[PDB]
Design an enzyme around this catalytic site. Structure first.
Site, mmCIF file in Angstrom:
data_model
loop_
_atom_site.group_PDB
_atom_site.id
_atom_site.type_symbol
_atom_site.label_atom_id
_atom_site.label_comp_id
_atom_site.label_asym_id
_atom_site.label_seq_id
_atom_site.Cartn_x
_atom_site.Cartn_y
_atom_site.Cartn_z
ATOM 1 N N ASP A 225 -3.285 -7.381 13.303
ATOM 2 C CA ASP A 225 -2.876 -8.221 12.184
ATOM 3 C C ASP A 225 -2.485 -9.652 12.568
ATOM 4 O O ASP A 225 -1.761 -10.335 11.829
ATOM 5 C CB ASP A 225 -1.756 -7.561 11.385
ATOM 6 C CG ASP A 225 -2.280 -6.788 10.180
ATOM 7 O OD1 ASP A 225 -3.456 -6.349 10.214
ATOM 8 O OD2 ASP A 225 -1.518 -6.636 9.194
ATOM 9 N N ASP A 226 -2.937 -10.083 13.742
ATOM 10 C CA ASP A 226 -2.691 -11.427 14.242
ATOM 11 C C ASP A 226 -4.053 -12.006 14.599
ATOM 12 O O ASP A 226 -4.299 -13.202 14.447
ATOM 13 C CB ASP A 226 -1.784 -11.393 15.478
ATOM 14 C CG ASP A 226 -0.315 -11.592 15.131
ATOM 15 O OD1 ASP A 226 -0.018 -11.780 13.929
ATOM 16 O OD2 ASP A 226 0.539 -11.575 16.055
ATOM 17 N N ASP B 190 14.091 -12.336 4.662
ATOM 18 C CA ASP B 190 13.125 -13.014 5.522
ATOM 19 C C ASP B 190 12.646 -14.339 4.882
ATOM 20 O O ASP B 190 12.751 -15.422 5.464
ATOM 21 C CB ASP B 190 11.934 -12.078 5.722
ATOM 22 C CG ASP B 190 11.264 -12.241 7.059
ATOM 23 O OD1 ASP B 190 11.067 -13.384 7.536
ATOM 24 O OD2 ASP B 190 10.914 -11.196 7.634
ATOM 25 N N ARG C 115 4.807 -14.176 -1.906
ATOM 26 C CA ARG C 115 4.929 -12.878 -1.272
ATOM 27 C C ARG C 115 4.365 -11.858 -2.223
ATOM 28 O O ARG C 115 4.682 -11.890 -3.410
ATOM 29 C CB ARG C 115 6.399 -12.586 -1.006
ATOM 30 C CG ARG C 115 6.741 -11.156 -0.781
ATOM 31 C CD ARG C 115 7.483 -11.010 0.511
ATOM 32 N NE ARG C 115 6.560 -10.887 1.632
ATOM 33 C CZ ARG C 115 6.866 -11.242 2.871
ATOM 34 N NH1 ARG C 115 8.060 -11.750 3.119
ATOM 35 N NH2 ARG C 115 6.022 -11.016 3.873
ATOM 36 N N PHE D 164 -1.189 -2.611 16.147
ATOM 37 C CA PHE D 164 -1.260 -2.995 14.748
ATOM 38 C C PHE D 164 -0.954 -4.464 14.586
ATOM 39 O O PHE D 164 -1.667 -5.154 13.873
ATOM 40 C CB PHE D 164 -0.296 -2.159 13.902
ATOM 41 C CG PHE D 164 -0.108 -2.668 12.492
ATOM 42 C CD1 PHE D 164 0.860 -3.639 12.208
ATOM 43 C CD2 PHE D 164 -0.863 -2.142 11.442
ATOM 44 C CE1 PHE D 164 1.082 -4.077 10.904
ATOM 45 C CE2 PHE D 164 -0.653 -2.573 10.130
ATOM 46 C CZ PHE D 164 0.324 -3.543 9.859
ATOM 47 N N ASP E 103 13.111 -18.633 5.694
ATOM 48 C CA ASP E 103 11.824 -19.171 6.049
ATOM 49 C C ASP E 103 11.393 -20.196 5.034
ATOM 50 O O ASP E 103 10.478 -20.979 5.275
ATOM 51 C CB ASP E 103 10.799 -18.072 6.126
ATOM 52 C CG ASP E 103 10.592 -17.604 7.516
ATOM 53 O OD1 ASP E 103 11.397 -17.990 8.398
ATOM 54 O OD2 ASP E 103 9.605 -16.867 7.726
ATOM 55 N N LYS F 278 0.861 -1.180 0.000
ATOM 56 C CA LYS F 278 0.000 0.000 0.000
ATOM 57 C C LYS F 278 0.915 1.253 0.000
ATOM 58 O O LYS F 278 0.525 2.356 -0.427
ATOM 59 C CB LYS F 278 -0.857 -0.006 1.267
ATOM 60 C CG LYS F 278 -1.738 -1.232 1.441
ATOM 61 C CD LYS F 278 -2.796 -1.329 0.348
ATOM 62 C CE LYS F 278 -2.324 -2.210 -0.790
ATOM 63 N NZ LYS F 278 -3.116 -2.000 -2.033
#
EC number: 2.5.1.10
Lengths: 348, 348
Positions: free
Chosen positions: B238-239, B98, B107, B234, B102, B52
């Site tokens: 977002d969890d 990242d 993504r 936040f 992982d 965004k």
């Protein structure tokens, strides 16, 4: 004298315990991020202290040869040492990351960090962290110095240049087809420059210069004129002395053709080779097998690399003398002579 | 107004082609390192432009709300935009690195960079390169500015702090035993702060502040007092909005318990759980299997997380008001209100 040289080395070496205390002392015990830094100490101690230190030690020799008696005090010498350890941590971060994208096994006589148990892929984030350390040591020792933002810019820049050459490498020499169509004169050269010459020779002295005030684009460019050259002769040497030398040696002592390494010799062989040998070369050069390997070395010797090296290093130490007497007008020539002495002496 | 907001976004977005031209224009065609930068353009375009932009866009909104009419000219607004794209490239470098550690797959709706063919492990060195870009854009736009060395220090520092939290994560949540003995209140909190709050909320506005002269340790610490808080709310949001929300959403849209993710809920479940459920949790939470996953979500709902979230976010937007009216004395409160508006609105 050895008395002096040796003395300088021990002074630098014995400072690392101090540096470690600078980077972690307070992190440790902090009720939020303590374990993170608690582990940082280990990354620090495991990967940083290791080589001859010849890189960081160059800073010290340079500022020594360049400062006037008014700037040879404790507080100023310690910043010489500290900025020397910054080059060393500059190397340690590239090395850690290097090994991982190479799936290497041994480094500095020990097991690569990522290969250590528990570690593995976390090693990437510790490569980032050692680099984060180059700038926290700069800030501890030089934040209130007129030269500060110069050093800061020098580092963030050379870091960009080695990163560029690092990628020229990762491209040029790929296992896939291995390819010998890429191993050429200007591309090999272009890799030694960015990936190595820059942070290995120019960077050290360049930081000695900024510390004694010398920030003139002209004198700095006169430094690149000759350090970028010894940086060439050094890599050529540390590529020749690989298969063709043993009687007393150090470093990446062993050999590595198992890795498709765009070394000097290779470019030199392809340079003066016949269609059959060319095919042989792109058939035997590139794998860990006593057979093919020694057949590559037979060809190099069959072609004439022992000559190719001599006439080159025979002209190298000459060009250098002419690059000194023509570029060391303001800067004390003794700086390069002294550096060259640790370099210009090959093994056949 | 949407008219304004929207207008600002498009202004930022349309600048990326410019940024790319800033980082590569000259590298391209250089007879030594041209292909390296030639590929850099691709790393740039593939990974940087994506979200965004809410992060970089915060810089722009902040300097707008903070500068006086004497500093709202073209040459000054473009540095607002450029320093906004520096946050974005700050994120892109951490993201690339990242994913690799992982072994992620997707993504921003595309295939992770390293997963791309030819790429793979080279992605590490491109993580280094995007980071090298944060500082070359700073130098292009702000090198002749009184605030420069402040921004430079801010970035090299927040980069150190996110790297610290990044490692708290890589430790706390390890597949090995997975372990639920670590997922605790202060460690979860300590991860949201360093790994996220810092570069996500404080960093943006903090760069707006340094640009209008505000470099007082007190006012900056009053900025950390509340941005580090919205950075908490936040992440909690977002969890929570992960399993428990769908009706219109964006981002890491999907869900991820397959990864042993030290999220809010988990810490909250273990918080108020029975021995059986605790064992169930350390038995069903941590793998991609429709079975165990939904049994973890059944337990969360069985325990009472829908309540736990409400009373919290019900107190969160309150504490914030008291953290504003108590910390926005010099700084225009409207800055945080406007930011909070894009945040404080959950989905059940």
């Amino acid at each position: 004298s050895p008395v002096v040289v040796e003395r300088e080395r021990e002074e630098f070496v014995g400072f690392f315990p101090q540096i470690v205390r600078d980077l972690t002392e307070d992190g440790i015990g902090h009720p939020e991020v303590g374990d993170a830094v608690a582990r940082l100490k280990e990354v620090l101690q495991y990967n940083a202290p290791g080589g001859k230190c010849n890189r960081g030690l160059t800073v010290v020799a340079a500022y020594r040869e360049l400062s006037g008696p008014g700037q040879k005090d404790a507080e100023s010498l310690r910043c010489a040492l500290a900025v020397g350890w910054c080059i060393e941590l500059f190397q340690a971060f590239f090395l850690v990351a290097d090994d991982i994208m190479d799936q290497s096994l041994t480094r500095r006589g020990q097991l690569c960090w990522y290969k250590k148990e528990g570690v593995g892929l976390d090693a990437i984030n510790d490569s980032f962290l050692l680099e984060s350390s180059v700038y926290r040591v700069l800030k501890k020792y030089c934040r209130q110095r007129p030269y500060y933002v110069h050093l800061l810019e020098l580092f963030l820049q050379t870091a960009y240049q080695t990163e560029l050459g690092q990628m020229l490498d990762l491209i040029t020499a790929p296992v896939s087809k291995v390819d010998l169509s890429h191993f050429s004169e200007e591309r090999y050269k272009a890799i030694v420059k960015y990936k190595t010459a820059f942070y290995s020779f120019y960077l050290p002295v360049a930081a000695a210069m900024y510390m004694v005030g010398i920030d003139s684009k002209e004198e700095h460019e006169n430094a690149k004129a000759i350090l970028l050259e010894m940086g060439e002769y050094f890599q050529i040497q540390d590529d020749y002395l690989d298969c063709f030398g043993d009687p007393a040696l150090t470093g990446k002592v062993g050999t590595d053709i198992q890795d498709n390494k765009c070394s000097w010799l290779v470019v030199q062989c392809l340079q003066r080779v016949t269609p059959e040998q060319r095919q042989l070369l792109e058939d035997n050069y590139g794998r860990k097998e006593p057979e093919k390997v020694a057949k590559v070395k037979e060809l190099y010797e069959a072609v004439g690399m022992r000559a190719a090296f001599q006439q080159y290093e025979e002209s190298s130490y000459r060009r250098l003398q002419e690059l000194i007497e023509k570029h060391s007008n303001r800067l004390p020539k003794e700086i390069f002579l002294g550096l060259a002495q640790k370099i210009y002496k090959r093994q056949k």
